[PDB]
Amino acid sequence: ALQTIINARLPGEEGLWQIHLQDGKISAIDAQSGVMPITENSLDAEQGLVIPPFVEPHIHLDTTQTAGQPNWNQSGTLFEGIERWAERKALLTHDDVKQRAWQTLKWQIANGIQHVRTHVDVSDATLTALKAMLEVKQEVAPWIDLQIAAFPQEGILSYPNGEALLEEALRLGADVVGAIPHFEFTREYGVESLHKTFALAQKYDRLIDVHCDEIDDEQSRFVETVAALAHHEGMGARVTASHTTAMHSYNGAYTSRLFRLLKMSGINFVANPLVNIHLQGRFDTYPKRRGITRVKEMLESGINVCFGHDDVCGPWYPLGTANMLQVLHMGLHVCQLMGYGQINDGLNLITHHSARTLNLQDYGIAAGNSANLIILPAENGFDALRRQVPVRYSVRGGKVIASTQPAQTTVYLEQPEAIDYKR
Amino acid sequence: ALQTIINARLPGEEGLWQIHLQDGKISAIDAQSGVMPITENSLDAEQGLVIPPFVEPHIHLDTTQTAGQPNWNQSGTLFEGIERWAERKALLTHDDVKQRAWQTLKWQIANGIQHVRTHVDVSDATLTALKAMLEVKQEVAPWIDLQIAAFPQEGILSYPNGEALLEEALRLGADVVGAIPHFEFTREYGVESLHKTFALAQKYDRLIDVHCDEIDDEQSRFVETVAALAHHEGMGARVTASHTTAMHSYNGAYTSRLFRLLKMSGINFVANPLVNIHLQGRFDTYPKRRGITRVKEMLESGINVCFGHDDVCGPWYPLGTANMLQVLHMGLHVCQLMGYGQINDGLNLITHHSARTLNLQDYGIAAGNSANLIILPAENGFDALRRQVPVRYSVRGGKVIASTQPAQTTVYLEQPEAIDYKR
Ligand SMILES: [Fe+3]
Ligand SMILES: [Fe+3]
């Protein structure tokens, strides 16, 4: 089957491009001087944008599809969400977890997402969801490379056998070590928990992704320990701080001091715009803070930052179709990244930057890489974002794994007219 | 003598009740269907409210009755108060302490208080006040069960031989181990001081009551260490955090996170409304914060909180008659617990909740308990509070130990009329 992608636009490049495929890899990328004809074994991008696959750097596949079960959250807070989740966690079964994880994973495949990092709550002696997710990881592997992050949701030091269970999760095969220092009983447990997390990541050679300062508390500064420990161990690339919503509330002087360390450390940041706008600012009356981390500033400083969906129809977020362009849309608005170039470059926040966060080794439209790429029916990132386009084709190992025939809208004026909303 | 209390109202109960007494204990409690006749050996509550005795969970009997000696405070701050007290402490004698402690204790007996926890400053190599108070404890025992809390007023780590003196105080018989982490030179001394306090309480099997975050500093969070250490040691019931006025100034997000630990830990909280309204907010100009801990929220969350008088005519508070209904009145206003039910249930804050704070084993109107109870000439808690009623009778071991013949007010209109201010 497929030998070429033709008539492709590429972000930050002029003109049209031909992507040659061989043995499941990209063999060569060649500029075109005009439109190429279609032929058998050519997939025509039709002057749409070709990008490496969307990435979901932060989702909770063990909580997905449980919104309102057994009860709703309600106050719309992180803290009530954890309480509601704890009630649902007591009701987990193996098949329950696999079915719900797979439901969301199919939406993700449909949405051109080929790389997903799922957190899985390991504050659970039975490790029910983890055992299920390890099977799901193997099952979905033809379509999605799933990383599993062992997430000690109720604390490492603040939950019975929390450290032991976290380590057990790694011994069972979790790819990433998690932590939640702002949810530990004390600041000292918070800091200690990070030492323990880093020690485990080094013992097992695993990545780190900390739920870090997800709280509107200007004194929640666990991020400095995450970055300092990464710098000390020389392991920045392998380390991620998720959320860091407290950073929205820091004074500017501390933030400036901190940013030097953040860039030196080389650690990654995940913002979760759909969830953060909902859960943050809940303790303000009016005015009410936005509560997303300092994405615009990170980008300006060359600090790697990217966007996750976080929860899809779960205890913290009742909405979602696991759509990364939608996540991006919310983040651009709330972060005021609304300049033409900022919007256009927005795709990086859900592609390349997220690949870096996942420490991916085979990602991007480049000769020698696996032929994993998606085609958006749009002229550039700005257009894709504005029109919230579907993924026309998703290609993995040089084979089509998803396609969307786009909607067709007609208005019946003096004559019928097709409406495509371009611009 | 006394065999029965008749015509008694009880909080949260309908109708009238008869309380049978035998051998200094309550033998039985029986509902009445109407008013019972008086007889010899019956004490007639006269459809007034019968409750277990008032409790003073936080007072400084070593500083009581010293207001303005040798100098006044003045700025009306915690910090100047400590300075003024230090000057008075240098002048203490054995008999001086006993006489002043006894003066306030008699006001307390008159006010139906049968349980008192006094702090005693043990930042004093001579332990003068402690030695006096240990004698007072034995002397007053027929009327008041006095707990002595060893209070390292000038710090454990920040005062010469502070830890040794604290331990000496326990060896001499103090019932409760104190601490003052926000007054230690550094945050690290604050945290360390709490480890040392818990270690002493476990070594000697004593209760803990920390002067905790009594400061308008949003960064004073020693309460999380007090609660975490209690939870770790499984000793919540035995532990109290006094004041926690900093909590008035916390952001809502941290407070929400903290509250989960506060409820899990099971520790007790004392607010001191008369003193807190006076000493807190002194560093604000306008607007000026109230500075009482989050009493309303604690009650809503089922966290045990109660009220103390703190200082009676002392270096921090020049007023007082050691009257718990007056303390309660101030707290209801400043905390905005002003709903009918909130006011009516206010008695719990100076009875049952305070008994829990003192870890009392024989408290409440229940069969088998000691016959320790007081009678208020009021229909319910709301009425008692509104009219600031005296204690008509105080009964201990089934014997009357105090009584008040109430004031009689007459207005001379066209005819004389008795005025009772009911409603
Ligand atoms: Fe998450
Ligand atoms: Fe005090």
CB pairs under 8 A between A and B: 44
Query: Which one of B219, B251, B257 has the shortest CB-CB distance to A79?
Result: B257
Task: Provide the number of structural domains found in chain B.
Answer: 2
Gap between the Cα atoms of A37 and A377, Å rounded:
18
Dihedral sign (CA B355, B356, B362, B364): positive
Radius of gyration of chain A (CA): 22
Residue among A182, A185, A215 minimizing CB distance to B261 = A185
Q: Which of A217, A245, A279, A284 best tests the B interface by mutation, with the highest count of B CBs <10 A?
A: A217
List of chain B residues whose C-beta atoms are within 8 Å of the C-beta of residue A158: 261
* A39 lies in the same domain as A157: no
The reply to whether A411 falls in a domain is no
Which sign does the torsion angle of CA A133, A135, A139, A143 carry?
positive
- Ligand 1 centre distance from Cα of residue B222 (Å): 29
Q: Report the candidate in B377, B336, B223, B305 with the shortest Cα–Cα distance to residue B58.
A: B305
Contact criterion met (CB below 8 Å) for B193 and B155:
yes
B211 is in an annotated binding site: yes
CA A198 to chain centre: 22
B266 and B374 part of one domain:
no
Per CB-CB distance under 8 Å, the chain B contacts of A157 are none
Closest CA to A360 of A145, A170, A201, A140: A145
For chain B, give the longest Cα–Cα distance.
Answer: 72
A256-280: burial string, b at 16+ Cβ within 10 Å, e else: eebbebbbebbbbbbbbbbbbbbbb
Q: Do residues B101 and B137 touch, judged by C-beta distance below 8 A?
A: no
Same domain, B299 and B230: yes
**Cα A245 from Cα B393, distance rounded (Å):** 58
- Here the CATH number for the domain that contains residue B31 is 2.30.40.10
DSSP 3-state of B26:
strand
**CB atoms near residue B140 (< 10 Å):** 19
CA separation for the pair A85, A129 (Å, rounded): 13
CA B112/CA B74 separation, integer angstroms? 32
d(CA A327, CA A58): 12
- Give the Cα separation of B204 and B234 in Å (integer): 16
How far, in Å, is the centroid of ligand 2 from the Cα of B226? Answer: 17
Sequence positions preceding breaks in chain A, C–N over 2.5 Å: none
B401 with B288, same domain: the answer is no
Experimental method: X-ray
Is residue B412 a part of any domain in this protein?
no
In sequence order, what are the residues at sequence separation of 6 or more whose Cβ sits closer than 8 angstroms to the Cβ of residue B328? Answer: B273, B307, B346, B347, B349, B350, B385
CA B159 to CA B196: how far, in whole Å? Answer: 14
Verify that B92 and B163 share a domain, yes or no: yes
> Contact at 8 Å (CB) between B233 and B266?
no
For an interface test with A, give the residue of B193, B223, B225, B257 to mutate (most A CBs within 10 A).
B257
- Phi first, then psi: what are they for A75, rounded to 5°? -75, -15
**b/e code A353-372 from CB counts within 10 Å (16+ = b):** bbbbbbbbeebbbeeeebbb
Output the CA B303–ligand 2 centroid distance in Å.
Answer: 21
Same structural domain, A112 and A124: yes
3-state secondary structure (DSSP) of residue B414: coil
- Per annotation, catalytic residue among A87, A154, A214, A300: A214
Write the burial class of residue A47 (CB in 10 Å: 0-12 exposed, 13-18 middle, 19+ buried): middle
Same domain flag for B311 and B371: no
3 state DSSP class of A262: helix
**Terminal C-alpha separation, chain B:** 35
Check whether residue A227 and residue A369 sit in a common domain.
no
Among the partner residues B218, B224, B255, nearest to A186 by beta-carbon distance: B224
Residues B299 and B368 in one domain: no
Q: Which residues of A touch B219 (CB under 8 A)?
A: 219
Closest CA to B247 of B231, B267, B230, B262: B262
β-bridge pairing B239-243 and B207-212:
parallel
In whole angstroms, what is the distance from residue B332 CA to residue A304 CA? 52
Contact B253 A216 (CB under 8 A): yes
Buried/exposed code over A177-212 (b: 16+ C-beta within 10 A; e: otherwise): bbbbbbbbbbbebbbbbbebbbebbeeeebbbbbbb
CA distance B232 to A379: 60
Q: Is residue B182 part of a domain?
A: yes
Contact B143, B170 (CB under 8 A): no
- Identify the helix (H) or strand (E) that includes residue B83: helix B78-89
Q: Is A218 a catalytic residue?
A: no
Structural domain containing residue B219: 54-361
Ligand nearest to the CA of B82: 2
Q: Find, in chain A, the residue whose alpha carbon is nearest to that of B219.
A: A219
CB neighbour list of residue B249: distance below 8 Å, 6 or more residues apart: B216, B217, B218, B289, B291
Cβ atoms A332, A348 nearer than 8 A? no
> Tokens 């003096």 correspond to what residue?
A414
Claim to verify: residue B371 and residue B330 sit in the same structural domain: no
Question: Which residue of A185, A188, A218 is in closest CB contact with B191?
Answer: A188
Helix (H, G, I), strand (E, B) or coil at B268: strand
Interface of chain B toward chain A, CB-CB under 8 angstroms: 191, 218-219, 221, 224-225, 227-228, 231, 251-257, 260-261
Q: Of B40, B214, B218, B224, which is the active-site residue?
A: B214
Closest CA–CA distance from residue A202 to any residue of chain B (Å)? 28
Interhelix angle A187-204/A162-171, nearest 10 degrees: 20
Which of helix, strand or coil describes residue B394? strand
Same domain flag for B86 and B139: yes
CB A155 within 8 A of CB A184: yes
Whether A421 is in a domain gets the answer no
B261/A79 CB distance under 8 A? no
Domain end point (choices A361, A378, A394) = A361
Please check whether residues B162 and B188 belong to one and the same domain. Answer: yes
Tally: H helices and E strands in chain B? 13, 18
Amino acid occupying residue A119: H
Q: Give the SS3 label for residue B164.
A: helix
**Is B421 a domain residue?**
no
- Residue A232, token pair as written in the block: 């000390």
Q: What is the resolution of this structure in A?
A: 1.8
- Does residue A418 belong to any structural domain of this protein? no
CA distance A183 to chain B (A): 7
How close B306 gets to chain A, by Cα (Å)? 23
Q: Ligand 1 center to residue A59 CA distance, Å?
A: 6
Let me know how long chain A is.
423
- Say how far apart CA A35 and CA A99 lie, in whole Å: 44
CA-nearest residue of chain B to A216? Answer: B253
Find the CATH number of the domain harbouring B64.
3.20.20.140
B121: CA distance to ligand 2 center in Å?
Answer: 10
Residue A415 lies in a domain: no
Please check whether residue A331 is in contact with residue A80, taking contact to mean a CB–CB distance below 8 angstroms: no
Taking CA–CA distances from B263, the nearest residue in chain A reads: A185
Flag whether A237 is in a domain: yes
Ligand 1 centroid to Cα of residue A270, in Å, is 10
Unique residue bearing structure tokens 């485990």: A200
User: What ligand has the least distance to the C-alpha of B312?
Assistant: 2
Q: What are the residues facing B147 on neighbouring strands?
A: B117
